[PDB]
């Protein structure tokens, strides 16, 4: 059993060279997700929020495939998140770096898909005056590939409901929104799109 | 209520 | 006699890959317990609260098992930690990642035993609203495999109750409850299990 | 197609040695542009003022050219910034080590084009006394190569202006003018100029 | 506002 | 020299397998002195105390040893000290990491004696109730090996004063008394003792 | 001709083994010196001042000197700092870990000297009590080697005058003086010396 | 007890 | 004032 | 004295 595991995490890194990265011929497709834990410090002084989240990520790799019946009937693996290629999804407006508060362990299935769910805490720009209102502040980040076009890494959701099943319930602040939405922009000089993930929290002090 | 557990997450990515 | 550990430890690491992790086959059963030192810090402006303490960590592997008699009589040896595979057990609601302040080196014994002790400074979610009363407050945190299930890492304790033989006398806040419970979680998609260990501290400022 | 990429890697990085750097026979000019996002942070007690910018760097190395109908019509490809050499730009009178907050992805293209485009937070000097007045306030920092020489590394700029057009709305300052402008030094022993990019920014708190 | 764009930068080195 | 220099480095590292540590059957001793440079800060709202330090460390091992003879009379030589085996001494009751503020360099000589000397600063649970009066207040904290018994590493110290010649003359605090105290803990389970040396200090604001 | 330059670095690190430091057979001179920006943060509560500066450091090895017209007339070349030996000047009395600022390159000449200049960012121990005065206040610090004697590493300077020309013009603080003298110290147990520079300034708040 | 000691519950288990 | 730059300083070490 | 500077002790380990 143990054996077929060895020589299948031996085939697919140390038999083959390591994923180059998308392109226009082999793109490549990134759902995101986020559950959103707390928010844990709002500071008016200089307008950075800090979230503390699970950040879902889901793609499909060929070169990642292989043949259960080949293997003991083994479906499934998790390996480090440093073995494999990642997609660089950043917070585009982050104020600091971003802090990962998980192991970071990705797990591969015989269809090639990998899931790789990173917990961090990220501090970013957002004005929070209205937060000690009925009415509430809110506030964005987008997430996107900081150098892949739409072309080249296509990016969306699977609902547009942030799942806020996990928050923490003696929070200082109350969730009265929050939202992933998938966004497609186009500039006049350029025909390929650039997309990102916006992240919308509305939120306010609780009492 | 998996879909908010990180391990129940990647073993089911079907309904996650 | 200081031969035969350089023999050891050549048999069991340069001679076999990695051990790649527990699979629904070849599950692993963890032991879990925690020595708790300190409460360090209390932020009740952003329900933060720092602790200071001892993970100890217990599992046996059949592919570090070797003979006592084979090897000049030697029953256990300490090596580094990043020599090993050690599991990804994770409070699941910290809020920055954690600081080690220990050495992380584990002793293995003859009988595949590996037992792991790094102490660890962990901030975590916790409503500290009640610390400077009589009845103090309550705060919780769950430990668990983050990618493993219960099919594939069997989380137990060897006692419900905390450790607080090593308690600071002369700290701030005085630890009325201090208990290490195994939880179990169902999902109605799933049939697989999903275990955790809930750390549950009652405490209150010393008066 | 996706071979065809892994085999351009290969002749470039693997079977190419690292660019040693530039010399005085083989000099090279580097593009520098920056792209503000927001002044975070304002220290009039300690004189210390903190930026979130992109940096743009651009410069073209002959040593990372190909043909592209030699490799599948391939013209460019991202990789990461750890395996190409990269110019050792430096703010002069940075406070603290700089933040990096996006991925370090550089994308090379046929003709020998490097462009790189790291997002960082950085502390510099500024005394920031009148920032609540009307006529605001102005920090300098100078951007140029620490161990290089004019004759070595040439810095340049595409335009004086700083790109604002990202800058945050919600901001607790407004900028009155941000400029990038490149300088040229002499000194009385010595033939070669030194270069340097001048970030020239006068702001106010926000009326 | 490509240019302002980290991805779009580098798609277009002759525009920006 | 130099020649016979890396000979002797190449002969020691290159050839034999890294120092496993000691065992039951070949144990160490360490000898272990402090030298206070400060008490930098004193938090009475946490009851956290920082001070900065030199920790001097001996040991004397077979496998570092060599005759000079054959190594052109070189008789010590100076090394990092991730190059060679060292202890892994730790004080038990840190709140935070470590930090290292010197080299981490040390010198072997011929007779296999080992000397490491790094610069530290150390924060540890204290209770300064007192700090501000006549009397003082007395913070008190263990240095021992993590993973060691007594069995295997002997601690031991070459006197019990700490060394208080390089005491910042101009500290806020002033040193009454200051000792290292080798202590022995025995439990009725097991044969082996347990060894640390207790490093305590008395002191007070100055007046 | 880029040829010459990788050639000549490849002569000097790979075709022998790293220097191992300077004995009492090759000593080596050591030339200290620094140019100081600007004072910081001024602590009173701790008696701890942060200084950022550059430091100037000099040396000349037989071991990596070259024939220039054997390497097309190159003279000088640049590498970074971890490639070749550097010297483990230390100053004595800092409380917090060097912050590095700038990148680490050196640059050495075909008559073996090496030039060094990191920018850094130094906490150390210094009672500010006076700044706020017209006298103003004191601070010095020692800088030496950490594990080299006076008669393996001999320390110098080039002046005793602080390069004070790139000096924050805006800086809270002024500077009264700022020296960098050579001392040799004696111990009655040993016939070697140790030698420090100390780094002597007389500041205060500015009006 | 033994069972708080980090040296002391690795080398003597069978006990911690 | 060269010795007072890092680059320059650095490719004239005769001078400073 | 010696067996406070940190080169003085390790070049004399029979002292300090």
Redesign the interface.
């Known amino acids: 059993s143990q054996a077929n595991l060895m020589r299948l995490k031996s085939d697919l890194f140390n038999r083959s060279p390591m994923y180059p990265g998308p392109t226009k011929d082999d793109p490549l497709t990134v759902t995101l ?1 986020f ?1 959103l834990q707390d928010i844990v410090k709002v500071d008016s002084s200089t307008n950075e929020v800090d979230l503390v989240y ?1 950040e ?1 990520q ?1 793609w499909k790799l060929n070169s990642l495939m292989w043949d259960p019946n080949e293997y003991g009937n083994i479906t ?1 693996f998790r390996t480090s998140a440093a073995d494999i290629w990642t997609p660089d999804i950043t917070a585009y407006s982050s104020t600091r770096p971003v802090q990962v508060l ?1 192991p970071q362990i990705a ?1 591969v ?1 015989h269809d090639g ?1 990998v ?1 790789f ?1 990173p ?1 961090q805490r990220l501090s970013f720009m957002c004005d929070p005056t209205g937060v000690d209102s009925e009415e509430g502040v809110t506030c964005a980040v987008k997430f996107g590939s900081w150098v892949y076009s739409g072309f080249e890494i296509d990016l969306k959701t ?1 609902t547009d409901q942030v ?1 806020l ?2 928050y923490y319930a003696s929070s200082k602040y109350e969730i009265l929104s929050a939202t992933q939405t998938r966004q497609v922009q186009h500039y006049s000089c350029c025909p390929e799109p650039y997309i990102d993930v916006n992240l919308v929290v509305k939120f306010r002090e609780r009492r | ?13 079907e ?2």
Chains 1, 3, 4, 6, 7 share one sequence.
């Open positions: 997700g559950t699970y879902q889901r499934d998980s797990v299935t898909s899931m769910i917990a699977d799942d099943s996990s | 209520g998996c879909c908010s557990h990180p391990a129940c997450n990647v073993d089911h990515p309904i996650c």
